Amino acid sequence: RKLEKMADQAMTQMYKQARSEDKRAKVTSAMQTMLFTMLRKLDNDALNNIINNARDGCVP
Amino acid sequence: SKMSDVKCTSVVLLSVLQQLRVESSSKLWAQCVQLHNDILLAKDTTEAFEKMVSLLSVLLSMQGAVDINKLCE
Amino acid sequence: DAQSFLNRVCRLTPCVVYRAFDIYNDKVAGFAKFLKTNCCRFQEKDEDDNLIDSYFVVKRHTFSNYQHEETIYNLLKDCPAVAKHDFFKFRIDGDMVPHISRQRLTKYTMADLVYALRHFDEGNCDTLKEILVTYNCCDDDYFNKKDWYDFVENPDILRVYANLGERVRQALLKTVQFCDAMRNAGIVGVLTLDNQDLNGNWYDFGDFIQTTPGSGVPVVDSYYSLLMPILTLTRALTAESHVDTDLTKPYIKWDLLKYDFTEERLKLFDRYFKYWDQTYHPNCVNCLDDRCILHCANFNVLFSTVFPPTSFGPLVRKIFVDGVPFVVSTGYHFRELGVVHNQDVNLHSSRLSFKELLVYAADPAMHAASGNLLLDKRTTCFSVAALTNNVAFQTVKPGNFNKDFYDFAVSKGFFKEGSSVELKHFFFAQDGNAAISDYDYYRYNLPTMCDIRQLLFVVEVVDKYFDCYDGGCINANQVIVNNLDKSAGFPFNKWGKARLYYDSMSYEDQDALFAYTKRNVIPTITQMNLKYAISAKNRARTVAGVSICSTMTNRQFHQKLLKSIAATRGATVVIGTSKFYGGWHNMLKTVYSDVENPHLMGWDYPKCDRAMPNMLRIMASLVLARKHTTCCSLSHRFYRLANECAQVLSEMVMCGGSLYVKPGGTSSGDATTAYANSVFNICQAVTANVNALLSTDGNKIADKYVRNLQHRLYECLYRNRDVDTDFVNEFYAYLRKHFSMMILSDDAVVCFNSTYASQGLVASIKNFKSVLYYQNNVFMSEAKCWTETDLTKGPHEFCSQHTMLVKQGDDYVYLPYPDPSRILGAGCFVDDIVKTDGTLMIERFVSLAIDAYPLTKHPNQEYADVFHLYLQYIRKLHDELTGHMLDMYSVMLTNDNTSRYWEPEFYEAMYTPHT
Amino acid sequence: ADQAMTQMYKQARSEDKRAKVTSAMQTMLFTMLRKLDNDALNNIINNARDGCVPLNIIPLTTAAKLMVVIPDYNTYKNTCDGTTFTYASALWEIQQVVDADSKIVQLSEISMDNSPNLAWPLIVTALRANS
RNA sequence: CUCAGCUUCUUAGGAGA
RNA sequence: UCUCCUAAGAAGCUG
Ligand SMILES: *Cc1cc(O)n2ncc(C(=O)OC)c2n1
Ligand SMILES: [Mn+2]
Ligand SMILES: [Zn+2]
Ligand SMILES: [Zn+2]
C-alpha cells in the first residue's frame, strides 16, 4: 500500500509539472483567443464595428 | 449591465497588450494603463465602453502585431 | 458714566464670549475655554476712521489688588515687553472705585491661538479664521475652498500657517525680555499664555510677589510646553536662516564641510528658551536616560530646521586597508540626536574579515562616493547620487483572468444587474514613473515638535501597557528566522538571499556584529519595491527591503520581546491572536471588559507610515528598548537607538537605481514595524484622553474623584518633574476602566463609557481629530472613523473584517466575515498564469472557502451564496482533475478523503472554540 | 552514517558559498574605489578640520558627471536651458539627453511645440565644466 | 520582489498510548 | 490505529 502512495505522489508531481509547462507555453495564443471570445460575447455595436473595420483593413 | 464583462475584457486586453511588448513605449503604456484603471473604477457602462473602444483601438492599430483575421473566423 | 469715563480712558469707539485660559489653583486646573469677566473694551480707530487691532481694556478692581498690581507694574514698568497700564479712580455712587486700563492690547492672546490650533474642529474654527484674516495670513475668500485646512488635500495651508511664524518668534523674544525684567526686579510669578497678547506684550501681574531684586524667578513650564507644537507648525524660527536674522536679507551661506552645530544650537536655546530650567544636551549621546533623550531630541528637532540639509547623515572618513583608500562612515549627524561618533574606528587596517567586509559593503558611503551626482526634479526629496548611468522605470502588470471561475459563477447567477455583490478588487497596473511617485508621498512628513511635558507623562502611561512582557538580548543561536528565502537588501541581493548570509556567518560572527552595533553606527540602504497585490484602490504600494545587517542585529535585539507580545492573550495588543476557533469572540469579549455605558468606536490613521513624526517613532523605539535594563548599559542602549534611527528612520533609500534621503516615517519592512505602530497608536489614544480631560471645565465636573484626577493630572504634567508612579498607576487604571482598547498595528477598537465621553471625561472622535491635527499633521475625516452604539452589532470593521453575532450550537458567538467582493476578486483574478488552471490550485480555493464560510450566516442570501459557489467549484475541480488523471494515465485517484472539502462541516469546525 | 555525510556535504557547500560571496564583496569594494576622483576627494578631505565630512557633499563637490531627471518642459526651461547650465555652484555642459525609452533626444527637439511628442521624463547627462 | 501574525494541505522524522 | 513535536515544500488571509 505504501508503494501505491509513492507512485500516486510521483504521478501527481508529473501531472503538475506537465500542466504547468503547457499552461505557461501557450500563454500568448491562449490570451488572444480569450480576448476575442470575450469581445464576441460583449456584442457591442462600436466594438464590433471597429473589429470588422480592422478585419477589412481599415485600421486607425 | 455588462459592467463586469467589460471590466474582465479590459483586464484581458491590457494583458494582451503587455504581452505584445507595449511597455517598450512609455507614452503608449501610460495611456493604456490610464484607460485600464479608469475602466476598472468605472460606475457607468457607457463611459467604460467608450474607454474600452479607446483601449482596443491601440491593439488594432498595430495591425502586423496580432492577426485579427485568423483570431476571429 | 458713559461720557467722562470714555474721555478718561482716551479716538476710541464706545463699548458672552469664551476665551482659552490656562488655570491652576486649589480648586480647578486645566487649559480650557471659560467665560470672560466683565470688562470695558474700547476699540481704537485709526486717524482715517479705520478700526485697528488695538483695544483699551478697563476693569474695576478692589483696593488691595489695585495697589498690588500698581506696585508690581511700577517695578516692571520700564520693560518694553510689558503693555502700558493706566491706574485711576472713578466716582460711582459718590465714592471713588479703582480701575485698571490695560492699553492697546490685541483682540486675542497667545492662549487663544494655541487652543485654536491644538483643539481644532473644522466646524467651529471661527477664532482661527479671525486670527488668520486679521494678521494678513489669508483672506475670507480663502475659506470658501473645500478642505482649506487639510494638510494632504490642501498642502498650501502650511504657507498660511507659516505666515504666523514671525509673530510667534517676536512673542518668544518678548517673553525672554519679560523674564529678564522679572529676575532683575526680584519678582516671582508664573507666566501663562493667556496673559500675553499676540503682539507679545504681558499685562497681568495679579499673582506676582516681590523678592530681593536680583533673585526673581519666572515659571515658564506650562507656557513653553503648551506653545511648543505651534513653533514647528507655524515655522517660527525661519528667520534664523537669514543673515542677521532679518527676513529681508539673503540666506546664510554655511560651509559645506561643516556638520557640528553644537554652538549654534546652544545659542538658539539661550536666545529663545533662556529660562527653561532643565538641562539641554545638543548631542543626545550625553543624555542621562531615555526621558532626557526625548527631552533634548525635542529641542534638536526644533533647531535642526535652521541648518543646511546637506550637513545631516553619515560622516565619512578616509581609511587605508592593504594600503588602498576606502571612504567609510565613522559617525552620523542626526536631526534629533545630534552628532554621534563611532568608538571603534580603525585606520590602516591589515585585512578585512567577513564581518568588516559586510559592514563596508552595507555602508552607503562607497556607493554614494562612486556614484554620479543626481538632480531628480520629479520629487522634492533630497537626492544623493545616481549609482547607474541610466534610470530604471519599473512598471506594474495587470492581473490574470481566471475565466473558468468567472463563467462558473455567472452560470450560478452571479454578477447580475442590481445585485449587492459586485467586483471591486482588481490588479491595477502602473506606468514607469510610479515607484518614485509613491516615494514622493514622504512629503507629508514634516518636522513636528511635541508638547514635551505631556509626552513625558504619556510615555509612562504607555509603558504601563507593556509591563506583562519580557525582553532582552539573545544569542545568535536563539534567533528564529521564519523564511530564509527572502531578499537580503542592497547590495546583498545581487549575491544571494538571506540564507546565504545566515549560513556564511557563524554564530560567533553574528554575535560579533551585534556587539559591534552596540558601540558603532552602521548606516544601511533600504530598497523600495513595488507590491503586486489585489486591491480596491488605484494607489500603488511600495515595500521597504532593509539590509541584512540591520535585520540581523534588530532581530537579535528585539525578537524576545516581540515573541513575548505575540504569545500573550487577553492584552490590549492583539498581535499574534488567531481569529479562528473562537479567537474573534474572545477578543471582543476581552475588549468589552465590563465598561459601564459601553459604546464602540474605531479609527485608522491616514498616511500612517508616511506621516508619523520622528519624535513618536523615537518614543516607540525607547519604549520597546526599556526591556534591556539589565542586559545593556546606557551607552549600549543609546547606540542601539542610533543604529535604529540611521537604518529605518532617516536612512538612504534605493529607488530605481538612485539614492535618496528619507525624511522620516516608519519603514514598513523592518523588524519591529507592527509593534512600533501599536506603541504609536496607544500613545495617540492616551494623548487624546489627556487632552479630553484637561480641556474640560473643572467647575462643571460633578464627580469629585474625576475633578481631583484632573487636578493631579495637571500637576503631574506641568508642575511635577519626577515621575509620580502612584498617579501613573491610577490614571492607567482609570483608562482601563473607562477606555478599553484593542490594538493591532495602526488599527484600533475602543469600548468606552459613553456618559464620560459626552461629559468630556474620556476621549471621543473629535479629540482624536484634534490630536492628529496638531501632533501628526493629518486631518482625519469622519468617514474614516466609525461609532457603534449597539454592542450586539460588534465593531463596524477591524482588520478589514465585519462582525456578526450568530447562534453556534446553544450560545451566541461573534464571527468575522470579509467583503464578498474581496473573495470573489481573489477567485477571479490571480497574479500568476499557472494559478488560472484550477485543477492545480484546489488548496487555494479551500483556503478562500475557509475565509468565506461565515458569509453563510449572513441575512443576505447573495452574501451566503459565495461559500456555496466555492464549494461547488471545489467539487467541479476535483471531478475535472480525476477525469484528466484517468485520461492521461489508466489509473484511479482513489482519494476518498477529499469529499470533506465540499461539505460545510470541515469549514464550520474552523470557528468552533473546541480547538 | 548517511546523516553525517549529508551534514559534511552541507558544511562544504556553505564554506564554498562563503568564499564565493567574500570574493564577490571584495571585488565590488575594490572596483568602486577606482571610479572616484582622487584629486577632489583629497582636496576636500584635507580641507576638513578633523577628516570627517558629511557624505551628502561628496557627490556635490567631487562628482565629474551629473544626471538630471526632468518631468516636463517647464522644469527643463527652468533648470537646464541651453547647452550649459549652473548647478551646485558649478558649471555643467550637456553631454547627452535621452527620453524615458532610453532614446537620444536632440536639444533642438525640446521645444514647446514638440514637447507633446517626447517621452517624458528626459534624462540629461552633463560633465563638470572648467576641467 | 520587505517585516510580522494566523490558517490549510503534503512529505520526512522523533516520542507516547 | 491515535495524539503531540522537529524540519522541508505549496497555498490563502491580515496590517
Ligand atoms: C474682559 C477682559 C478683562 C481683562 O482684564 N482682560 N485683560 C486682557 C483681556 C483681553 O482679552 O485682551 C487681550 C481682557 N479682557
Ligand atoms: Mn489673565
Ligand atoms: Zn539630555
Ligand atoms: Zn539588551
Author numbering:
A (entry chain D): 57 to 116
B (entry chain C): 1 to 73
C (entry chain A): 3 to 12, 18 to 22, 30 to 929
D (entry chain B): 63 to 193
Describing publication, verbatim:
The kinase-like nidovirus RdRp-associated nucleotidyl transferase (NiRAN) domain of nsp12 in SARS-CoV-2 catalyzes the formation of the 5′ RNA cap structure. To generate the RNA cap, the SARS-CoV-2 nsp12 nidovirus RdRp-associated nucleotidyl transferase (NiRAN) domain conjugates nascently transcribed RNA to nsp9 (RNAylation) and subsequently transfers the RNA to GDP, forming the core 5′ RNA cap structure GpppA-RNA. Although the NiRAN domain adopts a protein kinase fold, it acts as a GDP-polyribonucleotidyltransferase that catalyzes an essential step in the viral life cycle. Viral replication is abolished when mutations are introduced into key residues in the NiRAN domain or nsp9 that participate in the formation of the cap.
We identified NiRAN covalent inhibitor 2 (NCI-2), a compound with a reactive chloromethyl group that covalently binds to an active site cysteine (Cys53) in the NiRAN domain, inhibiting its activity. The Coulomb potential map clearly shows the density for the ligand and the covalent bond with Cys53. NCI-2 occupies the active site space responsible for interactions with nucleotide substrates and sterically prevents the “base-in” mode of binding. While there are no significant clashes with the “base-up” nucleotide orientation, several residues typically involved in catalysis and/or nucleotide phosphate binding adopt different orientations (Lys50, Lys73, and Arg116). The catalytic Lys73 is displaced from the salt bridge with Glu83 and is replaced by Arg116 that normally interacts with the nucleotide phosphates. Lys50 moves toward the back of the active site and forms electrostatic interactions with NCI-2. The heterocyclic ring of the inhibitor forms extensive interactions with a hydrophobic patch formed by Val71 and Leu119, while the methyl ester group forms hydrophobic interactions with Tyr217 and Thr123.
